RNA sequence: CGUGUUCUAAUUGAAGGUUUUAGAGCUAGAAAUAGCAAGUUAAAAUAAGGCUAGUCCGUUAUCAACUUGAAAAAGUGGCACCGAGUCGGUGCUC
DNA sequence: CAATACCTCTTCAATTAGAACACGG
DNA sequence: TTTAGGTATTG
């Protein structure tokens, strides 16, 4: 006789229970435990809060990291295992010192000095070769045998930090001189293209190409010197290509299909080559000439140093950085001595202040130290060039800085190679292992290979040819690499909804194509002059149509049918076709795709070869990497010409279908012995449809399927709640709410509800890049003209201006950067139709009156001027298809009366699909009973509501919701949603299809919805009491019921249950604190004394436990008795459970009482004394446990007082509210007294409270809007949970935390329900 | 069907940061002190660590209590009424 | 004791897959 | 992107 309404949010879940007259019931419960009480009475409405659920994204980037960090450790491992024999010969302990290089001299086992043991020599190496990049030049240059331990020393370093694989190819650093290389291209292109010459013109190609200027520009700067060549003309692309780019010369050679080329991209050498043959072999020389330049320029940025001396340029730049520090370090210090020597300690000796002494020795970034000395360099004189260097960002470079990592790995490998080549003569073992050693630097598992697991990884999927250990060297052979690649993908791709078991067919499969075609053809009707009835296409006719027309054309069209087949074959001079649009919707595209590739039409037609064409496409869809693609294209390799095969690889396919293969031809109807495809070709008689067939009872197809949906019988609840497409947090809630219902029903005597009413409610650097790119494609200097910062664009009217590129969207005029305030944000589509605050639906222009009518999308006039302008933006990606299409809409007829009706509806019916399964799951769990007909006995209605019913209802009925005041409102919001949705479908059963779960003309529809919520009101002239005119049933009573709502709303006691959740996650703050004399510090590794070595700190605690036990005090070690809290940290927790006592004793608690220990999750609740209540938060601290049941009038009063966004109300009413603000303006004192009395009673943090009071007291003069909003601020001290910062108008009130758990220890412990209804109460004295 | 954004799940890379150690500091001066020279680099751990010993796994999800289960998860607590500062009383069942 | 006041690893690359959602045709 | 438990500091 009751109904349950619930609110499901990210962090909260609101529930309620309602009588037959919208009252809320009031039951007396039991209370297990030792306390005197044996029952308590509580209301039937409330909310269960919790911590927001957390996504796996951080955890995965950890998952990734750990797999990542160790592999790098492994590379440093293979060098040693290569080296071990020859290193012991040379040195016994070199490797041992390195492993133990970290340990303290006292704990050091071998000689402290890693490289040579001796103190004297190590000093020597460090001063001939002071930075490891001074050593890296030597052994790529020197032709004199060198100490092996220096050689390994070089090698690991490159391997440990190796360079990025963004670019894959081979680099011959014979490319140092760009000018020479470029000029050589001018030559070979002239020879190729005698007719139109190029003249070199003495461009500082090295100078032009070399420069930092943006990549697109340089090719422009180069073509600005040429005498009159087009940018995109053949030369231009080539030039553009060497510089990293993906130009296109398809337009100069008019290839039918676009021919795009990246040197960097893996698919280049063939790609040009696959292309190159197609333009003649002659050019091929031209591109290589281009690559050779690319190599010389490509590396240009790492070193501008003359190539000619050095075969190891990259390392050389670092030596250069070192020198350019030194003299600028002498000259700075020297200059400071020359001027302002007095302030010289701060700059160098003192770490704290960002001084150079800070820079080397303190936590001072390169950007933190450059902006410290900025005044000083400027203040100083004789420093002028120095200034220039810094502005360049070159002032005092360090060898490791954030940027490196635009160093490709192929010079780090360029330099590994030089060393081996250099010294393999001295040492035979290198030539034996040069390949291995290079392979260590070279080798990266691909993504599709996955973790090299052996059956123990939830994550990994690879499969093994040989079970021997995998080493970079043996890799291809051990891993079933291709097969593994098909495994990568076949776990993230779909299964048929109809058939769970069969994995979905790829999109470009011929069979889907013979299915789509034969299906769209099944319902073609045709008529001619002679016939009585227009009739279906016959089986003979369809096959004839598919074979002739479709197999001959990509697209088959209506008059292709009329004249090509009927006239040619059936000779109907003229015909009428009912079935189709201008052309058939499907096409036999894949059939056509192939015909071009292999040119054997009968082959495609032949049935026997048909499983090849699906295992061609399943392999062509399935794979990304062209080398990978080849492997399974060998299996069918024998038949085709070699020339085709090369062609075959290129046309890769994408996307996947929804239909399987046993469907389309998989299953056979028993009586008719035909599969759907069979059915589709030749069904009739009548030509049945896929949909039809799947519901033809006469047919077995529905029946057979029936088993398929059933198999596995669904899955248990979280197994299902964790597969719904949505927020991780939202799913957590979805679960929690059902755990509420099964109680609320359990509570209501296991009596199922009449109605269950559900609601759900609804970047800093992202803005920077999108603009960054957009201007670049646009090429405007507007970004240059005015620059801005990454922290600035959370303000739209600023941010919008940039996407619009400083021009009026509706006006074609430039914009005032400074006075954005005068201008107006305009939402393209009016808010009344839809509520959109997105960058997608907003625009900024001076006046929002130039778009057009208030009541429509931007006017035809607006589109005409700037439709074109809107294209530059879309291409720039400065706007979007959603943003664009609406903007251009008006020429689409804009918003029809049909459109408007649609928006007004969607405000009220929830179409959000995440809120659907949730609705569905309730119905399924709730209604299990089955009637004699297959039909379902729906005994609980489910209802989904949009927020706007309830949110508006408070606005129009004096039920205002103030979020800040109490955590209660989340619970009122079920109640309202309960009675709203119950009373709705008691007046309009017709809407039950829309509002409840289970199976032009618009203008009126607009009316039907807009006024739907009228009936509650007395005047809009409505009768007080509502009814169903059909059933003669009462639904509403304006007088009695409204009063009831107020009675429910202001109820003093609501159930508010912070979920007790055990803490999880990282053990402690990731930061590694320096060695300290503290027992707080945690030893980073099991041997490493943090007093000695440093450690972590700040461990989080998965749950605390009360030990009532004894410890010894004093020399006597007398055993006293304690009862304290011991938090068990998350490192510790695993250890605890194996045995607590042994673990507990270890801490030193003695004669621990085994039975007494009680696990306490974070957020546990104790009520001590006055009814002041507290939630555990950490072992040492507790949280505000109390809620404020503010009498409503104060709740109502404030909402108006804050006066949010001024007033949105209808004008006459606004007068009505205001007097009451100041009739009851004295209420403000009432509120403070309410906080003031309560704060004294429960919050119990007086030291602050006087402080708070005073702020209000001296601000009595200030207006209510000011004072009024702020009192709302002041609620923050009050609120359930943990202290945070807050202020009155300018006065900031710091928090007061609760610093020990002692006061809990002889107090009541409350273990409540998932609802707060059932409790068990524990008086802690013992 | 086409397209596009957004968000989620997985995999495989790069660059910094941090932490002890190694880069013979000197000149005075009994000393705290005070004069100047030096600084740019490397090694190593990078969740403690687990057994299934992999170039594997190690921060998501799920969690009142009590009886019971390995775990999953099943089982446990009268009703009415009048009233309201976090549930208080009444009558009834019991 | 419990009042104040500081601290909290970061920023980039590449590849697949699928909902969900909103424009067009 | 800011909270809200851990840390040692000062009165």
Swiss-Prot record:
A motif (PAM substrate-binding) lies at residues 1295-1297. It is an enzyme of class 3 (hydrolase). Residues 912-1064 are annotated as: RuvC-III. This is CRISPR-associated endonuclease Cas9/Csn1. Only has nuclease activity when bound to both gRNAs (crRNA plus tracrRNA), which results in conformational changes in the protein and formation of a central channel which binds target DNA. Also requires interaction with PAM to trigger catalytic activity. Nuclease activity is inhibited by EDTA. Changing residue 841 to A: Decreased DNA cleavage. Processes guide RNAs correctly. In vivo, retains Cas9-mediated CRISPR interference in plasmid transformation. Mn(2+) 1 binds at residues 7, 759. Changing residue 67 to A: No DNA cleavage. Mn(2+) 2 binds at residues 7, 970. Monomer. Binds crRNA and tracrRNA. Endonuclease activity on target dsDNA requires Mg(2+). The RuvC-like nuclease domain should have 2 divalent cations, while the HNH domain should have 1. Crystals are often soaked in MgCl(2) or MnCl(2+). Changing residue 969 to A: Decreased DNA cleavage. In vivo, loss of Cas9-mediated CRISPR interference in plasmid transformation. Belongs to the CRISPR-associated protein Cas9 family. Subtype II-A subfamily. Changing residue 1295 to A: Dramatically reduced target DNA binding, slightly decreased target cleavage. Residues 715-762 are annotated as: RuvC-II. The keyword Metal-binding applies. CRISPR (clustered regularly interspaced short palindromic repeat) is an adaptive immune system that provides protection against mobile genetic elements (viruses, transposable elements and conjugative plasmids). CRISPR clusters contain spacers, sequences complementary to antecedent mobile elements, and target invading nucleic acids. CRISPR clusters are transcribed and processed into CRISPR RNA (crRNA). In type II CRISPR systems correct processing of pre-crRNA requires a trans-encoded small RNA (tracrRNA), endogenous ribonuclease 3 (rnc) and this protein. Changing residue 162 to A: Moderately decreased DNA cleavage. Residues 1061-1326 are annotated as: PAM-interacting domain (PI). Coexpression of Cas9 with an artificial single guide RNA (sgRNA) which fuses the crRNA with the tracrRNA in human cells has shown it is possible to target and modify DNA sequences of interest. Cas9 plus the 2 sgRNAs have also been expressed individually in human and mouse cells to achieve DNA targeting; cleavage efficiencies of the artificial sgRNA were lower that those for systems with the 2 sgRNAs expressed separately. Microinjection of Cas9-encoding mRNA and a synthetic sgRNA into zebrafish embryos induces targeted mutations. Changing residue 1094 to C: Probably inactivates protein. InterPro entries: Cas9 (IPR028629), Cas9-BH (IPR032239), Cas9_PI (IPR032237), Cas9_REC (IPR032240), Cas9_RuvC (IPR055228), HNH_CAS9 (IPR033114), HNH_nuc (IPR003615), RNaseH_sf (IPR036397). The lineage of its organism: Bacteria, Bacillati, Bacillota, Bacilli, Lactobacillales. The gene is cas9. Residues 763-908 form the HNH Cas9-type domain. It comes from Streptococcus pyogenes serotype M1. Residues 53-70 are annotated as: ARM. Changing residue 75 to A: Moderately decreased DNA cleavage. GO terms for molecular function: 3'-5' exonuclease activity; DNA binding; DNA endonuclease activity; metal ion binding; RNA binding.
